[PDB]
Design a protein around this ligand. Sequence first.
Ligand code: ANP
Ligand code: MG
Lengths: 331, 96, 239, 96
Amino acid sequence: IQNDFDLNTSWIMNDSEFPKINNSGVYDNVVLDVGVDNLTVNTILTSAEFVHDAFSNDALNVLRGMLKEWWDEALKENSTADLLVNSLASWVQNPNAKLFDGLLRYHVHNLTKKALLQLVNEFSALGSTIVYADRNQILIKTNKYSPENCYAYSQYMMKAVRTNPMFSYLDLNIKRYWDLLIWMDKFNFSGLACTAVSQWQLKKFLSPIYQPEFEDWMMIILDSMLKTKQSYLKLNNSLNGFSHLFSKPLMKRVKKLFKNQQEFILDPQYEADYVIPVLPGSHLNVKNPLLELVKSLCHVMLLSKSTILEIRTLRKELLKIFELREFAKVA
Amino acid sequence: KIYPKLHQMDMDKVSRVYADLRRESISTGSFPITVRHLESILRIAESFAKMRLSEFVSSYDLDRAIKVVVDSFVDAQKVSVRRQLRRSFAIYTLGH
Amino acid sequence: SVLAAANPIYGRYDDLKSPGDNIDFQTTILSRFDMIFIVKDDHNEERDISIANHVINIHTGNANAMQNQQEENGSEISIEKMKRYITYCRLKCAPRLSPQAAEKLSSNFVTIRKQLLINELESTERSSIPITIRQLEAIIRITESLAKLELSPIAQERHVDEAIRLFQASTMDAASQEIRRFEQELKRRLPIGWSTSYQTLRREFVDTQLALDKALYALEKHETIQLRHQGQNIYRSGV
Amino acid sequence: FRKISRDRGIIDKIISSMAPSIYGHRDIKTAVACSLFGGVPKNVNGKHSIRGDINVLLLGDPGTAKSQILKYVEKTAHRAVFATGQGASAVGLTAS
Ligand SMILES: Nc1ncnc2c1ncn2[C@@H]1O[C@H](COP(=O)(O)OP(=O)(O)NP(=O)(O)O)[C@@H](O)[C@H]1O
Ligand SMILES: [Mg+2]
């Protein structure tokens, strides 16, 4: 029967993707970059016709008990047993495995999915809030304001998770501490760590003359958000008013760059730095690269859920430079 | 004597206003936002331009018309939700 | 031809209420309408954006040029041309159903009658809309009109297809409007991400019985279950 | 009219002038101004006629000048008539 096509079998074979969570925003709270490992091993251990693409419960019980055997022998430092347990994630997926089964790969996979969601449920049940989550990593808003206050609380939090039986074997690891985080996806973020880092796939699609400009203004925005955070904390969502520390310089700069673009975009002396790059996944055409930079900068700043109105007004007054209407689809 | 025209009005401004007003008007007890309310924005913008004796409707007439209609909708609400609606629709009105 | 327009009682159409409650007109007078359309706001954002762009194009005055373009393109025709054409169709043509069309209409009548029977058993209440033999006369009449457009002397099977489509789009939607235990038994027995073949669920629940397919409908309306692979696999897709 | 209209403040000077001895209620005076100037009626190719008039409802508490605002407009509009409650009938309102 395995020679035949089957719609369940083909779905089982074709499907793999985690429902990975990505709550974009600015975060003045400290954010914990929780690394994870042993999720496959942990779920196989902590696991538990009418259902016709579930792997056989007997064989799964054998795999669980055998993995408990291997795990105990790894705790006693049978180096071979540890090498075995570390390699189990390959075997449940490798089609060259002599006992490979698509139903086994899928049963393990969707159990892994369910457990990642339960881990998120536990972290949120402990009062925190999740910025991002996938099978290798979780970023968590703490409901706390300073890393030097939180090095105790973070280790409490991680221990409180791993002491729940559902997550007994996870390699929960606080891989970074963020003091301030600007986040839209795991390829487009910036923040201060405990020291400032910036990586933006957005930048790569701007034309070359504007890529340095984007990074410079990103550092200015981070510096302004930092100054405003600590200013609010000396007075005592803390970001309210941060645009006012740089908005007028930004508009002056952008007026000057628009004049320069009108002077030089046509010019063979300078056109090379105005060429928009060709790249993987290069989604769309664009006719005005300065507008692309301004769109990107306004979008990054519009991630600030507390402060949308001041950014929105600044975005209007920037788009006025091009005689672009505030809600025009070009903008 | 005066017959204004909507020469180069901000379509997407109005369209997003209608789309959001319709979405928040899904509340079954609220003021029933309808296509005739979109026409109301356009009629009102013409009326303000008429007050200016203006052949053409400006953005300011249309912005005031939007602000009038949005305020009329936002105040037609039980107070448990009015603050949230005010905050959401502020992106359209507080540009003016 | 009576072309009537009306609002529901209670102003907007109320989905929690029956159509016989939403409508003041009696079943006697309702039967005399060959087609009833119940029209509702979807409140869908993309639809409302499309309507908004269109309405503003009406008000800004571009619509005059747009219709003139569509008429020069032949995608639209003028009022007077259509008036003359309607009169020409009315005076020159009166199509008949082909024998194949006549059988297909008869079979469609027994089909929708079977559908109303199962719906009235399921709802355990008789519908406000009477799908009697009088409504087959309406579908015949629509078939004939559809053939009357092109002056075809016979109404072919394709005209019955479009007539059936319009009746299904109008009066059927006007008319066609213990589980608590089986639904949560299925929530327990079928976990997330796995699939149950329908025939086994039928055997498992019937051996304890039409509450089954209402449990399927309810769990299908919510995100929790998704009928999949020609409906043969019940897939616990959501919560 | 031409001279005073080109003042960039003319709209608010009109709206303040609406029912001048009625304090505050600036949204009512705005709506009354909009209604009393009206939009533009339209007809696309003769096929689709569109309302130019703007209809306004004043809903609110006793002793808040709503009736007096109507009595102001009765003096202010060129063609107007005033009817109250059980003093009206359906035919007395439309035609008979
Ligand atoms: N803001 C105001 N300025 C001046 N007079 C006011 C104001 N508000 C109320 N009044 C006075 O209130 C009296 C009654 O006003 P009226 O127009 O009947 O209010 P109303 O809202 O229509 N009340 P009601 O008929 O019960 O709905 C008038 O004599 C007005 O002079
Ligand atoms: Mg009164």
